[PDB]
Each structure stands twice: as C-alpha cells, then as structure tokens.
Design an enzyme around this catalytic site. Structure first.
Site, short mmCIF file in Angstrom:
data_model
loop_
_atom_site.label_atom_id
_atom_site.label_comp_id
_atom_site.label_asym_id
_atom_site.label_seq_id
_atom_site.Cartn_x
_atom_site.Cartn_y
_atom_site.Cartn_z
N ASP A 153 13.26 -2.25 -8.50
CA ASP A 153 13.09 -0.83 -8.75
C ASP A 153 12.99 -0.06 -7.44
O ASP A 153 12.15 0.83 -7.29
CB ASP A 153 11.83 -0.59 -9.60
CG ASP A 153 11.75 0.83 -10.13
OD1 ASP A 153 12.79 1.52 -10.17
OD2 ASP A 153 10.65 1.26 -10.50
N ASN A 158 9.42 5.16 -4.85
CA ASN A 158 8.63 3.96 -4.66
C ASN A 158 8.42 3.58 -3.20
O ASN A 158 7.94 2.50 -2.91
CB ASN A 158 9.26 2.81 -5.43
CG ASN A 158 9.12 2.97 -6.94
OD1 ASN A 158 8.19 3.64 -7.42
ND2 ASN A 158 10.03 2.38 -7.68
N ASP A 171 5.39 -1.19 -4.98
CA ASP A 171 5.98 -1.91 -6.08
C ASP A 171 4.98 -1.87 -7.22
O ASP A 171 3.92 -2.51 -7.16
CB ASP A 171 6.31 -3.34 -5.67
CG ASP A 171 7.14 -4.07 -6.71
OD1 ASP A 171 7.16 -3.63 -7.89
OD2 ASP A 171 7.77 -5.08 -6.35
C1 LIG Z 1 3.81 8.53 -12.55
C2 LIG Z 1 3.67 8.94 -11.08
C3 LIG Z 1 2.47 8.29 -10.38
O1 LIG Z 1 1.36 8.38 -10.88
N1 LIG Z 1 2.69 7.57 -9.15
C4 LIG Z 1 1.63 6.97 -8.39
C5 LIG Z 1 0.55 6.32 -8.97
C6 LIG Z 1 -0.45 5.79 -8.16
C7 LIG Z 1 -0.35 5.91 -6.81
C8 LIG Z 1 -1.46 5.34 -5.93
N2 LIG Z 1 -1.13 4.24 -5.02
C9 LIG Z 1 -0.70 2.98 -5.48
O2 LIG Z 1 -0.51 2.76 -6.85
N3 LIG Z 1 -0.47 1.98 -4.50
C10 LIG Z 1 -0.09 0.63 -4.88
C11 LIG Z 1 -0.85 -0.09 -5.81
C12 LIG Z 1 -0.47 -1.39 -6.14
O3 LIG Z 1 -1.26 -2.09 -7.10
C13 LIG Z 1 -0.97 -3.46 -7.22
C14 LIG Z 1 0.68 -1.96 -5.54
C15 LIG Z 1 1.43 -1.22 -4.61
O4 LIG Z 1 2.60 -1.75 -3.95
C16 LIG Z 1 2.84 -3.17 -4.10
C17 LIG Z 1 1.04 0.08 -4.27
C18 LIG Z 1 -1.15 2.12 -3.25
C19 LIG Z 1 -1.06 3.43 -2.69
C20 LIG Z 1 -0.99 3.72 -1.31
N4 LIG Z 1 -0.93 5.00 -0.93
C21 LIG Z 1 -0.90 6.01 -1.79
N5 LIG Z 1 -0.81 7.34 -1.24
C22 LIG Z 1 -0.60 8.56 -1.95
C23 LIG Z 1 -1.01 9.82 -1.23
C24 LIG Z 1 -0.84 11.02 -1.82
C25 LIG Z 1 -0.22 11.12 -3.22
N6 LIG Z 1 -0.07 12.43 -3.77
C26 LIG Z 1 -1.06 13.40 -3.43
C27 LIG Z 1 -0.98 14.67 -3.90
N7 LIG Z 1 0.12 15.03 -4.74
C28 LIG Z 1 0.21 16.40 -5.25
C29 LIG Z 1 1.10 14.07 -5.08
C30 LIG Z 1 1.02 12.79 -4.60
C31 LIG Z 1 0.16 9.99 -3.88
C32 LIG Z 1 -0.03 8.63 -3.20
N8 LIG Z 1 -0.96 5.79 -3.13
C33 LIG Z 1 -1.04 4.52 -3.61
C34 LIG Z 1 0.72 6.57 -6.22
C35 LIG Z 1 1.70 7.09 -7.03
#
Ligand SMILES: *CCC(=O)Nc1ccc(CN2C(=O)N(c3cc(OC)cc(OC)c3)Cc3cnc(Nc4ccc(N5CCN(C)CC5)cc4)nc32)cc1
Length: 275
Positions: A153, A158, A171
C-alpha cells in the site's frame, strides 16, 4: 468483545526484555492523526534524561479481542523488520503492567501528500526537494525489500514527514488503494516487491504533481479496463522527462521490466548529485 479484554484483570503478555520500555518514562499527550488506525497519541519519552517526542499506539476503550490481536501482531512484525532511517521504527513496548502501549517514532509534519499540497505555489518545493523526497522513500523501500517486507500500500498518504523533513514510510497494514495497485495485484491479488515498484511510480507522480490525485476524473471501477488497455498517466508539469522516464518504467506491464528499488535509489541519487 470479548473474552480476553472482558475476562482478564491483567493481560499476561510475555516479557521481551529487548523491547520493554518503562511506562513511567512516558508522558502521554494529544491524539495523533484521524484515528482510522487504532488509538495513537503523541508522547514524550525520557531517555530513548532527555525527552524526545514519540507516537504511542494503544487499544481504543471499546477495542475487541481482534484489535488486541492486531496490535500485538503489528508489534511483533515491527520487532523483526529492524531499523532504518526512512521508515517508521518501533522504539519500544509496554506490556507488563497496565495497558498495552506500542511506541513508535513520531513524524511531526504529517503525511507526504498533505505536506506537499500545503506548500504548493500560487521555491519551497523545488526540484531538489522533490527528488530528495523520492530518493528517501526509495531508500526506505530498498531497505524494506532487503528484509523481505512487501508493503502493498505504498502511497504518499502513507509516507510521514518528520520535523527535519525526513521521509518515513508508515505501514497501517502489518496485521482508496486501487489507484496505487500494480495490474497483477488488481487482477490476480498477486503482491511482490515489483508490484511495490509500480506503486512507487504512482508515488513519484504524486510527488511531482505536488500531492495530486492519481488518474484524475477516472472512477475506480474503470481503472479495470484502462490499465489493461495500456493507459498511463501523463508527465507532471513540474517534472523533467528523465524523471517521467523513471515513472513510466515503474508502470511497465511486465514486472521484470520495472526497475528494482536499488536502481531507483542509484538513479535518484545521481539526479540529486547533479544539483
Ligand atoms: C484515516 C486517516 C488517518 O487517521 N491517518 C492516520 C492515523 C494515525 C496516525 C498516527 N501515526 C501512526 O499511526 N503511526 C504508525 C503506527 C503504527 O502502528 C503499528 C505503524 C506505523 O508504521 C509501520 C506508523 C506513527 C506515527 C508517526 N507520526 C505521526 N505524525 C503525524 C503528525 C501530524 C498529523 N496530522 C496533524 C494535524 N492534521 C490536521 C493532520 C495530520 C498526523 C500524523 N503519526 C503517526 C497518522 C495518520
């Protein structure tokens, strides 16, 4: 929902000393992302006595046993993949007292699609910046490939961007996608490293359209015929023919005739040098 999370006072998960992180060296904070993928919060982790910002995944307060299984499974898969600069790395786990916590690197700027789109011109997203984005993702895929990991994906949504604009492949499926799928994956559910290369081509197009949507104006049910009929996306305006050449190689109908990730890294590295 049901027996393990309802019946147990405590979840007796096995101690893995390589990964266990003390729960009191952790300060949980604001939710992170839109919560499509379980409950993830920002946190400060101490001594990873300097803090550092991390992301912490845990079970939603209404989680099922299946959500428990999926988080553990995601956690176990990430232990084996090993670390690399251009992927979201496991940093630690909390399994022994209280709630299951999975600690990941935080990427403060969100995903690559939104990062690009926010910094669109009416510069910031110069040719060297875009090539650098591509290059970093290719290096991450080269690594994943060498660990025998098939992403399935790969898309700009992503890829997460840190405070230092480092690309980190996330992922959310270790436990809509059609526009990023290789023909063998669409038609025959076959997934290989070469079908990831196809996706990387779509991601390259995403980068050079500054976060554009793939196949604009085309409904998902038609991508069907179109790709069979040999349809391919055109050259983004912000894109040299030579980089477009790379995209087009990634969308070769024959998986063997698409470049490898090693090749993509070397080619993109060379473009970078030429600046
Ligand atoms: C449907 C759209 C959606 O909700 N996307 C989404 C969900 C959750 C996250 C948060 N995570 C994340 O899930 N990471 C992660 C987890 C995981 O579990 C096993 C495996 C991964 O890869 C193998 C990854 C970790 C991670 C690291 N950094 C971030 N940073 C982030 C900063 C800012 C934002 N936003 C802030 C404000 N706005 C308005 C939009 C977005 C998003 C993520 N997140 C995660 C991320 C996306």
């Amino acid at each position: 929902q049901d027996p393990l999370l309802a019946g147990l006072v405590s979840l007796d998960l096995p101690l893995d000393p390589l990964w266990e992180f003390p729960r009191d060296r952790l300060v949980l904070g604001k939710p992170l992302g839109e919560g499509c993928f379980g409950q993830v919060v920002r946190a400060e982790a101490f001594g990873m006595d300097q803090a550092s910002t991390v992301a912490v995944k845990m079970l939603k307060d209404n989680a099922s046993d299946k959500d428990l299984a999926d988080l553990v499974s995601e956690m176990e898969v990430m232990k084996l993949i090993g670390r690399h600069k251009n992927i979201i790395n496991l940093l630690g786990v909390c399994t022994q007292e209280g709630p299951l916590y999975v600690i990941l690197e935080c990427a403060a700027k969100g995903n690559l699609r939104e990062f690009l789109r926010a910094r669109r011109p009416p510069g910031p997203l110069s040719f060297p910046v875009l090539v650098s984005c591509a290059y970093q993702v290719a290096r991450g895929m080269q690594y994943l490939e060498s660990r025998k990991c098939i992403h399935r994906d790969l898309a700009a949504r992503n890829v997460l961007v840190t405070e230092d604009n480092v690309m980190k492949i996330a992922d959310f499926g270790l436990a809509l996608p059609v526009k990023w799928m290789a023909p063998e994956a669409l038609f025959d559910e076959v997934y290989t490293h070469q079908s990831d290369v196809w996706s990387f081509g779509i991601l390259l197009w995403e980068i050079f359209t500054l976060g554009g949507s793939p196949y604009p104006g085309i409904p998902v049910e038609e991508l069907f015929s179109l790709l069979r009929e040999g349809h391919r996306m055109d050259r983004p305006p912000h894109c040299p023919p030579e980089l477009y050449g790379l995209m087009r190689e990634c969308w070769h109908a024959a998986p063997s005739q698409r470049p490898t990730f090693k090749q993509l890294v070397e080619a993109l590295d060379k473009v970078l040098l030429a600046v």
